[PDB]
Amino acid sequence: LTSGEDEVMLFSAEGKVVRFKESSVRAMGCNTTGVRGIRLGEGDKVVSLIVPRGDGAILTATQNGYGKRTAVAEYPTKSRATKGVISIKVTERNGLVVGAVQVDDCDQIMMITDAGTLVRTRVSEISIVGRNTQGVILIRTAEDENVVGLQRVAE
Amino acid sequence: VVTLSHQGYVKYQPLSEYEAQRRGGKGKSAARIKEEDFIDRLLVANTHD
């Protein structure tokens, strides 16, 4: 749900962030195709969407349960249908970016794999790092497993 | 909390059944997975929504 004036952030599994004002997009009818809003590359899919609100809340994840917390304000904003910057290091211990959430402290998150294995932990043990950093161990993923879900649990 | 399968099977469970821990644990299986299926969705919401 989007109010009259806010911001839209798009994310990709290859570490792409695109921020632009929602004013540049006009309302349309029901059975309308739409328009392109991000200069998407090749071999990538938009796997997450966040509407920023408040401040000081950002989290990511990978196929092996590696993520980090970064400041919201350090993400550059350009016009729509434009290339973004690298959000997190791909490396080889992480895999592919699955989803992103806007969670501050005093909250908890849940991660579920393709074969169940539900888990619930807090965000106190994850610190604030720079954007160009690799992930750290969050959940001990098992063999033949990849993280599929990521949800935020409030206080 | 609501879980969905690839073939499509819905269910919700009380939130109090789970407890927080330290990062790096294994974690119990939330739902008895099928022989050939996998979970592709997850959501947390109030009962009256």
Find residues 64-123 of chain A whose CB sits inside 8 Å of chain B.
108, 110, 112-122
Please name the member of A117, A118, A149 whose beta carbon is closest to the beta carbon of B18. A118
Is the CB of residue A147 less than 8 Å from the CB of residue A64?
Answer: yes
3-state SS of chain A?
CCCCCCEEEEEECCCCEEEEEHHHCCCCCCCCCCCCCCCCCCCCCEEEEECCCCCCCCECCECCCEECECCHHHCCCCCCCCCCECCCCCCCCCCCECCCECCCCCCEEEEEECCEEEEEEECCCCCECCCCCCCEECCCCCCCCCEEEEEEECC
Tokens 């407890």 map to which residue?
Answer: B19
* Minimum CA–CA partner of B39 in chain A: A114
Way it was determined: cryo-EM
Is the CB of residue A31 less than 8 Å from the CB of residue A95?
Answer: no
Asked whether the CA dihedral A8, B3, A123, A141 is positive or negative, the reply is: negative
Q: Which two tokens stand for residue A94?
A: 């992480």
Report the 10 Å Cβ neighbour count for A84.
Answer: 23
Residue B15 near chain A (CB below 8 Å): yes
Residues in chain A within 8 Å Cβ distance of B15: 153
Asked whether the CA dihedral A52, A104, A1, B30 is positive or negative, the reply is: positive
Please name the member of B27, B32, B38 whose beta carbon is closest to the beta carbon of A118. B27
Helix %, strand %, coil % for chain B, to 5? 5, 25, 70
* Burial of A146 per CB tally in 10 Å (0-12, 13-18, 19+): middle
Cα–Cα distance, A63 to A46 (Å, whole number): 15
